[PDB]
Design a protein around this ligand. Structure first.
Ligand SMILES: O=P(O)(O)Oc1c2c(c(OP(=O)(O)O)c3c1[C@H]1C[C@@H]3c3cc4c(cc31)[C@H]1C[C@@H]4c3ccccc31)[C@H]1C[C@@H]2c2cc3c(cc21)[C@H]1C[C@@H]3c2ccccc21
Ligand SMILES: O=P(O)(O)Oc1c2c(c(OP(=O)(O)O)c3c1[C@H]1C[C@@H]3c3cc4c(cc31)[C@H]1C[C@@H]4c3ccccc31)[C@H]1C[C@@H]2c2cc3c(cc21)[C@H]1C[C@@H]3c2ccccc21
Ligand SMILES: [Cl-]
Ligand SMILES: [Cl-]
Lengths: 228, 228
């Protein structure tokens, strides 16, 4: 599909699609850059993340609208279209999890790197878990949990509490606890702990993370305001 | 593609896609409802219009970003991607113009109806004209002009000056004069005339057009504030 194009061209074009708000294309350019076989740099990791976040984020919004419209209070058309979109959402999720398993997630790699791709693995299993049901759902919840946890375990050892990759992970794992794992108990603990341990060792905050991590701190709190 | 589905189902689903903001799908459902062969009702005409407006509106925004990025002040990747998107934009435009020619535009029909589909024909030739160049562009400009004019000619005879279909037409034809036909002379005339002839016979304003047509009056003025 993209295999005739040089890796550098695919990356340039991925950057152009972010500016033009073409995230179906951006993701496609980044799927192709991953498949050139080389390890992604820090900037490239984000580019991949943003592309697929928007694609899958738009589908989830659509699914939630349509799923909300299945009232069943007091014809087939609503379910059919919800399923069409649901099926589409899953394909995109399965697509990212493929690239993560077959190319990006490796045992031997940087701490920043390994956590970033594991957080992502938990995110995309989380998105699948929202749409899944029955016996099939339990499996998907535990793969999400498992990937988030290994990511947490590493970040506590290898990263300071003001690190955006660590903070954004904790944010998303709390969201998993509340919306997916039905434990506002655990969700609140992890959120406040993350917020407080960050404020406790705020001296570790650095010039390069200042913007990214103060934003995730706000998000972390907005959630606790919303829950408590 | 959609040919197994009942017309009523396609319409229901088109309405569901507007709510879920899936205008690629909405347009596809409406392309299919048009191809059932039957004349579209007033509500259906809008549904079709909105679907394709958003699809083609998103592509134009992308094209204008990418085309703006061709600086050429003082590699091939920007042009290639602009062309990819340009080619895509044109296919969607050619697609609507097909449905208009082969199904919707008829000699024998309602005044409201005939004008609505001609306005649309001028709109989609306008979108093509923005991306086109050279000898090829002149043709596209004159087809836009020709369709807008026949639409104008009919609306002056058959519709009051407060009518939203008449007002929105005039709005778009002025926009054609300014951005496409390079005549801020004519664009300003038609705009103020539309605004003033509406205010002159404001007694004709009716309960059903009040919202739609006061909005187009604002748009008409915002444009004149912007031009003069
Ligand atoms: O070290 P950088 O990666 O260049 O960080 C800066 C950025 C940006 C900067 O703005 P600039 O276009 O004027 O250069 C800045 C930085 C550094 C330098 C300037 C800036 C300004 C500020 C801070 C860091 C930076 C601290 C103090 C002030 C600030 C406001 C809000 C949160 C954190 C901060 C852009 C680009 C980048 C950035 C990030 C964000 C945002 C905007 C930017 C939006 C979305 C996210 C964000 C978080 C919190 C509030 C608002 C945002
Ligand atoms: O006769 P309707 O088709 O039911 O018109 C109303 C509408 C709506 C109405 O609001 P509602 O949700 O409270 O029922 C109304 C109408 C009729 C009845 C109510 C309304 C209120 C008003 C008018 C007409 C209507 C005149 C006086 C007041 C108004 C404000 C701005 C412009 C024109 C008006 C919704 C649905 C529809 C509507 C249309 C618009 C909008 C919103 C609506 C947005 C986008 C466009 C618009 C134009 C100008 C300003 C704002 C808008
Ligand atoms: Cl469907
Ligand atoms: Cl391209």
């Amino acid at each position: 599909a993209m295999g005739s194009m040089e890796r550098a061209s695919l990356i340039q074009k991925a950057k152009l699609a972010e500016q033009a708000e073409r995230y179906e294309d951006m993701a496609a350019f980044m799927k192709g850059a991953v498949e050139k076989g080389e390890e992604l740099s820090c900037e490239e990791r984000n580019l991949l993340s943003v592309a697929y976040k928007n694609v899958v984020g738009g589908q989830r919004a659509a699914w939630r609208v349509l799923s909300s419209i299945e009232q069943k209070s007091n014809g087939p058309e609503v379910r059919e279209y919800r399923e069409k979109v649901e099926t589409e959402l899953q394909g995109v999720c399965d697509t990212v999890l493929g690239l993560l398993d077959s190319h990006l997630i490796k045992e031997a790699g940087d701490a920043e790197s390994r956590v970033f791709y594991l957080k992502m693995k938990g995110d995309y299993y989380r998105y699948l878990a929202e749409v899944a049901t029955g016996d099939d759902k339990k499996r998907i919840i535990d793969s999400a949990r498992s990937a988030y946890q290994e990511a947490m375990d590493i970040s506590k050892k290898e990263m300071p509490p003001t690190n955006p990759i660590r903070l954004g992970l904790a944010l998303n794992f709390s969201v998993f606890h509340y919306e997916i794992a039905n434990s506002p108990e655990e969700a609140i603990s992890l959120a406040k702990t993350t917020f407080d341990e960050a404020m406790a060792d705020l001296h570790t905050l650095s010039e390069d993370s200042y913007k990214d991590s103060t934003l995730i701190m706000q998000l972390l709190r907005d959630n606790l305001t919303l829950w408590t």
